[PDB]
């Protein structure tokens, strides 16, 4: 008997048919549009979409003016508003089912950096996330799976310790300066 959790959950579910041409076409279009790393990066968002739509179907099967239905519906709509996929005027549990994988992928921090335009490309934005040049509310975000909130969307800028912002320059600039001073004398 040791003191630990043993609680884990698979965030992705593989599809039933492995080699559907239309499914591979859709996933290839999704990655080529939104700059993703593999197919598991699509499948985990598809399974969170499966969770949200299955919860929405379970709430729509319930009767109107039910306390559990209203509580879970208002909680799920509050979660969708605070992650910023659903609009503030569309906060109704019947409009959750008309929501899509592209609208879930538009709120990725890679896509948020690409839409705010401080980067050049989507994969170049992922390069900036890897190389740790940006911060979100004085917190460096190294992992591009950060769900950007609607309140924290405007707080995305370059980080403090950053050669692209107000910091010391990097290895290539220091090597060029050292080579220039060695060539000068």
């Amino acid at each position: 008997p040791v003191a630990r959790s043993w609680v884990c959950r698979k965030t992705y579910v593989t599809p039933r048919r492995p080699f559907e041409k239309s499914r591979l076409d859709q996933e290839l279009k999704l990655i080529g549009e939104y700059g993703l790393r593999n197919k598991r990066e699509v499948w985990r968002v598809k399974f969170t979409l499966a969770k949200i739509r299955k919860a929405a179907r379970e709430l729509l099967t319930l009767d109107e003016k039910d306390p559990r239905r209203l509580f879970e519906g208002n909680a799920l709509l509050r979660r969708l508003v605070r992650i910023g996929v659903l609009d503030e005027g569309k906060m109704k549990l019947d409009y959750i089912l008309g929501l899509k994988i592209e609208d879930f992928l538009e709120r990725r921090l890679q896509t948020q950096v690409f839409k705010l335009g401080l980067a050049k490309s989507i994969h170049h934005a992922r390069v900036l996330i890897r190389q740790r040049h940006i911060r979100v509310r004085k917190q460096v975000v190294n992992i591009p799976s950060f769900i950007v909130r609607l309140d924290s969307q405007k707080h995305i800028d370059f980080s403090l310790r950053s050669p692209y912002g107000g910091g010391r320059p990097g290895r290539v600039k220091r090597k060029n300066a050292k080579k220039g001073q060695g060539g000068a004398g």
Binding site: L28, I31, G32, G35, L36, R37, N38, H123, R126
Partner: protein
């Protein structure tokens, strides 16, 4: 019988591996894959040939 084991592997000519520029991997591999699938080609009439289709 049992005396002809490895006949074709013994009698074929070994061809060395040709040197090649190393492949980009991961997100860059899938980006290059999308770029050679969609944005380079145009929709033409008839049946579209495969990637490995040669004449």
């Amino acid at each position: 019988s049992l005396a002809r084991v490895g006949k074709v592997r013994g009698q074929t000519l070994k061809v060395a591996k040709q040197e090649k520029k190393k492949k980009r991997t991961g997100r860059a591999k899938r980006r290059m894959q999308y770029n050679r699938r969609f944005v380079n080609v145009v929709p033409t009439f008839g049946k579209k040939k495969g990637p490995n289709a040669n004449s």
